[PDB]
């Protein structure tokens, strides 16, 4: 039943795929990825060596690392994601998100992957990023007592990264060693995991800078549709996601990188954690495909 | 007048990154007190590069001009009780501007004796603004480089200490004429440790194993609708911890020494905006003993 | 098993001295769990000496018998959260006596596989009482040396774990039939690090360059909430804070590593009466991350 | 006698309450068999509470003849105060009488006073020589730049009876101290740590003449849950010295008495009973005369 029958030989060049976090804006990510596999003609896990999605990557990265194809990812996304954001609450949203992770990821763990994976979350008590992984070669410290995915299924590891404090309740995690960790959304610490993934493919799995091909895929920038100290909250988050893209620009310059995210200006865009109109989201998917065509010349050079 | 010993040229390039505190800057003065006494020479003769946030900038600028630690302590114990005593946002920023007028009036980023870097993120681009001292410390756009954006040190250092919730956003006019607006330099990086290592490796052609980082913090102390304020205090903490947790991942093989201890007794409940010279003096004593626990390690770094 | 690493015998003597603070021993289990996994073997195959105190007595003995850290945690989480639930100080003693009977049924100080020592204070003479394991660890009166004072290893632990204001006073009967009155061992020395260096220099006379002392504490936490009560708690702090200040002057050429971190947030507030199973869990992982910051220097002493 | 013999004879003095007449009688018999003042046949002098007063006076001048004179006049007065605050003012008055304006600069021998801090909770030891500290050299001002009149008053501040003396160091930081009895009521061990690690002396080069005050009988559970911990620290530190420094020739002069008529209450303002302690203690020297003159030569 497979329609992609292309075989690419092994090489000494790593290819990293770093997805960003946008919530319900993942349709822009599905649009650009749907034409990336078409240029390759093969499943994505057969060409890439590392995927590091954050909150939305948690979803698309976990599905890509299992061996899914973008047609199947898009089918599940349009059917269930608009149902999650339909409830205006914090407990009711976590209840619905609980079943979505259960139906798509039944019982699989971080040993059923076919490539290097990593999901970003945030510890609420010590304020440090919690990065799930799949292999012991990606760890930097404490080589002993290493348990892939902390012995936790994909159902909880992804849902924990999706607990957006302002919209979702907090998520508790029980490690294989009995540790009861409480987590929240992974965006608060890093919303653009490009800096982490490059640090993952440079310290662990030591490779040269000239032998890495990083491809970042955002969600695009959109105009926004009682300032009780809430303006600062919005500002400190933007200052946080900014100055990181500025940081990796100074630290990693000799590493070829491509970012796919276009800014929109006309008053026809809206927020993400409240958009549930099928027609509204359908327009974002087409905009992502157009953004691919303008850069198809360079993407063919890297992905070959 | 008493410090006279001199040190020859050396290939190892040290670096001093000063944390950004507040009225708790006495801890940093206590730590640096024995460090200069142990060396026996002014700080600008041994260190090759200094980066500081708001509190640290006041000390970083004065060290770069030639002020000794005892002189900085004199200027600190005299004026601080005033600016921290006002009960208005426009009152604190007004008196703080007069203080900068008296310590240094006709001084820009050209009279400094060493490499300096002062942090401040903006209000429109949401990116840092790092006032450097020399053209070699830049990364790009090395065709239009005025040493310090043409701005004087008086209003440059004031911009770093502009905590928006309690101060007013300092508006700066550069030499080119671009009206830039900045806020407290601790909103993007409360600790310039990572920046100092970045500005010393990809900017200055120096490999690892030849860099000694000395991050002199200020110490952690207890504290004496509410949905947004709790989240604001926590988000500022995540960026503080995520930045150091990222530093030891990349630059793990770089010899670093962080001097900042923690205290848990309720009698030391120091917070921001402190003016009582009693509690502010005890914190200076704590900074003196923290050097005693790590003296046997620092002697290899500073020789 | 899954721990099948065999290390060759060398002249270096590795000492491990545990502290005691009550139900906060989970910090010690979290650190020791990472040290065992780093070695790949039980702890009694690499160390030559292990001491303990009010809590150490429970972990120092189990390590000398041959147990594993994964097994000690498999016991410390089913009875320790139970003994602290008793209301009276007498019921807290009737319960602790049954536990040693079920874990140390018949073993004495003769079937140990390393150098053991437990600290306890006499009530009349008011001096330390150290239950040694071998005659080579004595400093006089070797003619009448009886290992463990002829007392079972189950009774020599209930003494150190008997705080007078919270438990009863434990009286023992040694081999010579001497009814000795004992109390908790945290009154003369809560950190036996100075005792351990004292026991590896005059007895088993090694040089100062051939000892690697590894101290493990239980961390420091704020209070979760008269005149003599204040002085009672005040004098205990002066005793322990001046003892480690004394060994720093005496033994400085001896490499030491202390693993203890200070906590100040109002959520990490505990004492030696905690019985909340969830609150005890967070203290366990708090010590594990404390090992990660020091993993690069621990591997230098013990491979 | 002779100038130097490469021997580091230390003199650790204990202390507590008005019972210091004992060590006065013991010291009075000494300095007589020698013929020279005490500051000439000694290289180090430590003292915590009462010996501290005796430590300074020997280290800067007058001998035992004048010390007992200053002790028999003023001491019976400061103890005759019912309020806790009055004892501090009178004790401060006594300080400015004999210690008018002298500091730690005009001391003729190595001295050390013991007083524990109230905040950091660890001893604070005043010294008077450049080579007397083990670390943190530099920023080293002899005696913290504080006058002897205030350094000794701090070392004599029993908090339940006196008031916590506040000292302003020459650097400018105010330090809150209490007596040196809460940390170490016996500077014998501290004298070995300073004479061996700092002065770098061998293990058979020093002689330790520790002079006590003697043990005497006595005339809510926290009251007697407090005196006990204070003596556990005194006994535990004594035994630890025997373990580490068994090869150190020491001579402790402190006898015990069980007679009921010898019961003191640490604050006896009585001239007839404080004289018996001065008598009983002139004979304690006679029981070790044939041994002491091998140490002091
Ligand atoms: N690429 C990165 N970019 C930015 N930050 C990163 C990155 N990688 C790690 N960190 C941060 O550094 C801290 C220590 O990482 P270490 O690799 O040194 O040790 C790891 C490993 O040994 C083990 N482990 C990891 C993954 C897994 O699936 N199973 C598993 O067992 O647990 C520790 C993880 O704990 P956290 O993840 O909670 O903390 C991390 C993270 O905050
Ligand atoms: N170590 C670091 N880690 C992380 N980010 C860093 C670091 N260092 C700089 N940056 C960020 O990189 C952005 C661009 O810096 P560039 O060095 O590439 O070009 C500089 C220079 O050519 C010129 N110039 C600089 C200093 C001066 O006194 N006069 C002057 O004229 O202006 C540009 C300054 O712009 P900003 O300072 O506003 O923004 C910076 C900063 O946010
Ligand atoms: N490292 C140290 N640092 C500081 N002080 C230390 C240290 N080690 C010991 N001490 C103290 O020195 C005191 C005298 O000990 P001794 O060695 O001179 O004689 C011992 C021994 O011969 C015998 N005996 C000992 C243990 C046993 O299991 N069976 C057994 O029979 O009983 C005597 C009484 O021992 P305690 O242990 O009760 O009292 C000790 C201790 O308080
Ligand atoms: N024999 C001992 N046994 C047990 N503990 C001991 C012993 N000796 C010292 N200590 C402890 O060691 C801690 C730090 O001592 P340091 O030697 O490292 O530096 C000294 C010195 O350089 C300088 N200074 C000293 C004397 C003076 O008249 N003016 C002056 O300026 O101040 C520091 C004093 O501080 P504290 O005295 O408050 O604390 C001491 C003490 O608690």
Helix/strand/coil (H/E/C) assignment for every residue in C102-132 = HHCCCCECCCCCCCEEEEEEECCCCCEEEEC
Alpha-carbon span D82 to A278, nearest angstrom: 89
Q: How crowded is the C-beta side of D118, counted as CA atoms within 13 Å? A: 20
Token pair for B88 = 């208005």
Tell me the residues of chain B between 238 and 297 that have a Cβ less than 8 Å away from chain D.
267, 278, 281-282, 284-285, 289, 291-292, 295
| Torsion-angle region of B112 (φ positive above 0: left; ψ -120 to 50: alpha; else: beta) | beta
Question: Can you say whether the dihedral through the CA atoms of D65, D66, D71, D74 is positive or negative?
Answer: positive
D121 in contact with B at a CB cutoff of 8 Å? Answer: no
Q: Decide if B126 and A242 are in contact by the 8 Å CB cutoff.
A: yes
Alpha-carbon span D155 to D115, nearest angstrom: 5
SS3 content of chain C, % helix, strand, coil (to 5): 40, 15, 45
A contact chains, 3+ CB pairs < 8 A: B, C
Q: Decide if D236 and C198 are in contact by the 8 Å CB cutoff.
A: no
Query: Tell me, what DSSP letter sits at residue C8?
Result: P
A105 neighbors A158 (Cβ within 8 angstroms): yes
Bridge partners (DSSP) of residue D126 are D113
Q: Residue C249: its chain D contacts at CB < 8 A? A: 134, 193, 197
Angle at C291 (CA atoms; ends C288, C293), nearest 5 degrees: 120
A196 neighbors A237 (Cβ within 8 angstroms): no
A237 in contact with B at a CB cutoff of 8 Å? Answer: yes
Token pair for C170 = 């434990």
Burial readout A70-79 (b: 16 or more C-beta within 10 A, e: otherwise):
beebbeebee
DSSP conformation letters of C242-268? HHHHHHHHH--SS-EEEE--B--STTS
Residue D84, Cα to own-chain centre: how many angstroms?
Answer: 23
- The Cα of D137 is separated from the nearest Cα of chain B by a number of Å equal to 8
B to C CB pairs, distance under 8 Å: 22
D141 in contact with B at a CB cutoff of 8 Å? Answer: no
B90 neighbors B164 (Cβ within 8 angstroms): no
Q: Residue A240: its chain B contacts at CB < 8 A? A: 235, 239
A129 CB within 6 A, ligand 1 = yes
A122 in contact with B at a CB cutoff of 8 Å? Answer: yes
Beta strands in B171-300 (DSSP E): 171-173, 179-181, 211-216, 256-259
Burial readout B263-272 (b: 16 or more C-beta within 10 A, e: otherwise):
bbeeebebee
Say what the resolution is, in angstroms. 3.3
Best A243, A245, A254, A255 residue to mutate vs chain B (most B CBs within 10 Å) = A243
Which SS3 state, helix, strand or coil, does residue B214 take?
strand
D136 in contact with B at a CB cutoff of 8 Å? Answer: yes
C37 in contact with A at a CB cutoff of 8 Å? Answer: yes
- CB atoms inside a 10 Å sphere around CB B163: 20
D252 neighbors D54 (Cβ within 8 angstroms): no
Question: Euclidean distance between the first and final Cα of chain D, in Å?
Answer: 8
A254 neighbors B202 (Cβ within 8 angstroms): no
Alpha-carbon span C152 to C105, nearest angstrom: 9
Residues in contact with ligand 2 (CB, 6 Å cut-off) = A 246-247, 250; B 109, 127-132, 138-142, 145-149, 195, 198-199
Give how far Cα D267 sits from Cα of B139, C295, D67, D154, D162, Å: 76, 56, 19, 18, 12
Bridge partners (DSSP) of residue A26 are none
Token pair for B8 = 């020859």
Which SS3 state, helix, strand or coil, does residue D13 take?
strand
C41 neighbors A144 (Cβ within 8 angstroms): no
Q: Regarding beta strands A257-260 and B179-181, do their DSSP bridges make them parallel or antiparallel, or are they unpaired?
A: unpaired
Burial readout D76-99 (b: 16 or more C-beta within 10 A, e: otherwise):
eebbebeeeeebbebbeebbeebb
Alpha-carbon span C14 to A7, nearest angstrom: 57
D149 neighbors D209 (Cβ within 8 angstroms): no
A141 neighbors B250 (Cβ within 8 angstroms): no
Which SS3 state, helix, strand or coil, does residue C289 take?
helix
Question: Can you say whether the dihedral through the CA atoms of D258, D263, D267, D268 is positive or negative?
Answer: negative
Alpha-carbon span A99 to A76, nearest angstrom: 13
What are the structural domains, with CATH classification, of chain D?
8-288 (3.40.1090.10)
Alpha-carbon span B51 to B190, nearest angstrom: 11
Chain breaks in chain B (C to N over 2.5 A) after: 224
Q: Which residue in chain C is spatially nearest to D193 when comparing CA positions? A: C250
Contacts of residues B74-79 at CB distance under 8 Å and 24 or more positions apart, as own/partner, are B75/B103, B76/B25, B76/B26, B76/B29, B77/B277
Beta strands in D212-292 (DSSP E): 250-253
Q: Residue D175: its chain B contacts at CB < 8 A? A: 285
User: Residue A243 is nearest to which of B188, B229, B250, comparing CB atoms?
Assistant: B188
DSSP conformation letters of B220-251? B-----HHHHHHHHHHHHHHHHHHHHHHHHHS
Residue D145: φ, ψ to 5°: 65, 15
Token pair for C303 = 């491979």
Alpha-carbon span D269 to D253, nearest angstrom: 24
The kind and range of the H/E element at D234 are helix D227-244
Token pair for D204 = 């058979």
Bridge partners (DSSP) of residue A122 are A129, A184
Q: Decide if D135 and B295 are in contact by the 8 Å CB cutoff.
A: yes
Token pair for B40 = 């026996």
Residue D116 burial class via C-beta count within 10 angstroms: exposed 0-12, middle 13-18, buried 19 and up: buried
B221 neighbors B261 (Cβ within 8 angstroms): no
Alpha-carbon span A98 to A102, nearest angstrom: 6
D187 neighbors D47 (Cβ within 8 angstroms): yes
Token pair for D276 = 């018996």
Which of A242, A246, A248, A252 gets mutated to test ligand 2 (max ligand atoms within 8 A of its CB)?
A: A246
Expressed in angstroms and rounded, the spacing between residue C197 Cα and the centre of ligand 3 is 15
Alpha-carbon span C36 to C3, nearest angstrom: 9
Q: Which residues contact B66 (CB under 8 A, 6 or more apart)?
A: B42, B44, B113
B121 neighbors B188 (Cβ within 8 angstroms): yes
Experimental method of this PDB entry: cryo-EM
Residue D75: φ, ψ to 5°: -55, -45
DSSP conformation letters of A43-94? -GGGT-SEE---SSHHHHHHHHHHT--HHHHHHHHHHHHHHHTTS-SSHHHH
Token pair for B268 = 């030391």
C186 neighbors C161 (Cβ within 8 angstroms): no
Query: Tell me, what DSSP letter sits at residue D194?
Result: I
**Residue owning tokens 């000390």:** B59
D232 neighbors C188 (Cβ within 8 angstroms): yes
Q: What length is written for chain C?
A: 303
Closest alpha carbon to C10 in C156, C210, C205: C210
D contact chains, 3+ CB pairs < 8 A: B, C
Alpha-carbon span C256 to C214, nearest angstrom: 6
User: Residue D173 is nearest to which of B37, B285, B295, comparing CB atoms?
Assistant: B285
Alpha-carbon span B270 to B266, nearest angstrom: 9
Alpha-carbon span B275 to B259, nearest angstrom: 24
Question: Can you say whether the dihedral through the CA atoms of B26, B27, B31, B32 is positive or negative?
Answer: negative
Chain breaks in chain A (C to N over 2.5 A) after: 225
B113 neighbors B44 (Cβ within 8 angstroms): yes
Residue closest by Cα to atom 28 of ligand 1: A133
Q: Which residues contact C93 (CB under 8 A, 6 or more apart)?
A: C162, C167, C168, C170
Active site residue B54: yes
Alpha-carbon span A104 to A154, nearest angstrom: 10
Q: Decide if A179 and C285 are in contact by the 8 Å CB cutoff.
A: yes
Residue B150 burial class via C-beta count within 10 angstroms: exposed 0-12, middle 13-18, buried 19 and up: middle
Residues in contact with ligand 4 (CB, 6 Å cut-off) = B 292; C 245-246, 249; D 122-127, 133-136, 140-144, 190, 193-194
Q: Regarding beta strands D44-47 and D250-253, do their DSSP bridges make them parallel or antiparallel, or are they unpaired?
A: unpaired
C contact chains, 3+ CB pairs < 8 A: A, B, D
Expressed in angstroms and rounded, the spacing between residue C229 Cα and the centre of ligand 4 is 29
B175 neighbors B155 (Cβ within 8 angstroms): no
Q: Decide if B241 and A128 are in contact by the 8 Å CB cutoff.
A: yes
Contacts of residues A143-146 at CB distance under 8 Å and 24 or more positions apart, as own/partner, are A144/C34, A144/C37, A144/C38, A144/C40, A145/A177, A145/C33, A145/C34, A145/C37
- The Cα of A17 is separated from the nearest Cα of chain C by a number of Å equal to 29
B171 CB within 6 A, ligand 1 = no
**Residue owning tokens 């905690």:** C274
Residue B172, Cα to own-chain centre: how many angstroms?
Answer: 20
Alpha-carbon span D199 to A23, nearest angstrom: 70
Residue A124: φ, ψ to 5°: -75, -25
Residue closest by Cα to atom 40 of ligand 2: B129
Alpha-carbon span C250 to C258, nearest angstrom: 17
Expressed in angstroms and rounded, the spacing between residue A27 Cα and the centre of ligand 1 is 29
Which SS3 state, helix, strand or coil, does residue D208 take?
strand
Q: Regarding beta strands B171-173 and A171-174, do their DSSP bridges make them parallel or antiparallel, or are they unpaired?
A: unpaired
Alpha-carbon span B159 to D146, nearest angstrom: 42
Closest alpha carbon to C190 in C160, C211, C168: C160
Residue C127: φ, ψ to 5°: -145, 160
From the candidates B19, B48, B54, B160, give the one annotated as an active-site residue: B54
Token pair for B17 = 């990154």
- The Cα of C59 is separated from the nearest Cα of chain B by a number of Å equal to 27
- The Cα of B263 is separated from the nearest Cα of chain C by a number of Å equal to 7
Biggest CA-to-CA distance, chain C:
57
Alpha-carbon span C194 to C211, nearest angstrom: 13
CA torsion C106→C111→C115→C116, rounded to 10°? 0
Residues in contact with ligand 3 (CB, 6 Å cut-off) = C 127-132, 138-142, 145-149, 195, 198-199; D 239-240, 243
Query: Tell me, what DSSP letter sits at residue D209?
Result: E
C49 neighbors C15 (Cβ within 8 angstroms): yes
Q: Which residue in chain A is spatially nearest to C286 when comparing CA positions? A: A126
Token pair for C136 = 């080579």
Token pair for B195 = 């920046």
- Please, what is the angle between helix D51-60 and helix D21-29, to 10°? 40
B contact chains, 3+ CB pairs < 8 A: A, C, D
Give how far Cα C180 sits from Cα of B78, B164, C174, C176, Å: 63, 67, 8, 11
The kind and range of the H/E element at D22 are helix D21-29
Alpha-carbon span B20 to A123, nearest angstrom: 24
Residue C218: φ, ψ to 5°: -130, 15
Alpha-carbon span C57 to C62, nearest angstrom: 9
B220 in contact with C at a CB cutoff of 8 Å? Answer: yes
Best D188, D229, D231, D246 residue to mutate vs chain C (most C CBs within 10 Å) = D229
User: Residue C221 is nearest to which of B220, B263, B264, comparing CB atoms?
Assistant: B264
Give how far Cα A175 sits from Cα of A147, A197, C75, C83, D274, Å: 9, 24, 19, 27, 71
Alpha-carbon span D67 to D70, nearest angstrom: 5
Token pair for D92 = 């401060």
**Residue owning tokens 């290097």:** A116
Closest alpha carbon to A73 in A39, A45, A93: A45
Q: Residue A179: its chain C contacts at CB < 8 A? A: 281, 284-285
DSSP conformation letters of chain A? -----------S-EEEEEE---TTTHHHHHHHHHHHHHHHTS-GGGT-SEE---SSHHHHHHHHHHT--HHHHHHHHHHHHHHHTTS-SSHHHHHHHHHHHHHHSSS--TTS-SSEEEEEEEETTT--EEEEES-GGG--S--TT--GGGG--HHHHHHHTT--TTTS--EEEE-TT--EEEEE-STTT-S-THHHHHHHTTTSS---GGGEEEEEE---B------SSHHHHHHHHHHHHTTTHHHHHHH--SS-EEEE--B--SS----STT---HHHHHHHHHHHHHHHHTTHHHHHHHH-
Expressed in angstroms and rounded, the spacing between residue C54 Cα and the centre of ligand 3 is 18
Q: Which residues contact B241 (CB under 8 A, 6 or more apart)?
A: A126, A127, A128
Token pair for C40 = 């790949």
- The Cα of D200 is separated from the nearest Cα of chain C by a number of Å equal to 12
Give how far Cα C245 sits from Cα of B143, C232, C251, Å: 58, 21, 10
Q: Decide if D235 and C125 are in contact by the 8 Å CB cutoff.
A: yes
Closest alpha carbon to B234 in C192, A170, D159, C7: A170
């Amino acid at each position: 039943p497979s329609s992609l029958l292309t075989e690419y030989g092994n090489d000494n060049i790593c290819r990293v795929l770093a997805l960003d976090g946008g919530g319900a804006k993942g349709f822009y990510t599905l649009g650009v990825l749907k034409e990336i596999e078409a240029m390759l003609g093969c499943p994505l896990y057969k060409r890439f060596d590392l995927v590091f999605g954050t909150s939305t990557g948690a979803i698309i990265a976990a599905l890509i690392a299992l061996g899914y194809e973008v047609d199947q990812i898009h089918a599940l996304y349009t059917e269930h994601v608009p149902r999650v954001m339909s409830s205006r609450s914090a407990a009711a949203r976590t209840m619905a998100l609980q079943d979505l992770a259960k139906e798509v990821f039944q019982d699989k763990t971080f040993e059923d992957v076919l490539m290097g994976i990593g999901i970003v979350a945030t510890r609420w008590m010590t304020e440090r990023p919690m990065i799930f992984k799949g292999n012991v070669v990606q760890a930097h410290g404490r080589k002993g007592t290493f348990s892939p995915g902390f012995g936790v299924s994909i159902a909880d590891a992804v849902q924990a990264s999706c607990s957006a404090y302002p919209f979702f309740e907090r998520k508790v995690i029980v490690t294989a060693a009995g540790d009861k960790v409480e987590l929240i959304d992974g965006g608060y610490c890093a919303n653009n995991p490009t800096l982490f993934a490059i640090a993952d493919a440079t310290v662990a799995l030591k490779k040269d800078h000239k032998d890495i091909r990083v491809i970042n895929v955002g969600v695009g920038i959109y105009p926004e549709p009682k300032w009780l100290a809430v303006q600062l909250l919005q500002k400190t988050l933007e200052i946080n996601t900014q100055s990181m893209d500025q940081l990796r620009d100074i630290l990693f310059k000799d590493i070829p990188t491509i970012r796919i995210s276009d800014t929109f200006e006309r008053p026809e865009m809206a927020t993400d954690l409240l958009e549930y109109n099928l027609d509204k989201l359908n327009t974002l998917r087409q905009r992502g495909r157009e953004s691919f065509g303008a850069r198809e010349a360079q993407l063919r050079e890297f992905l070959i």
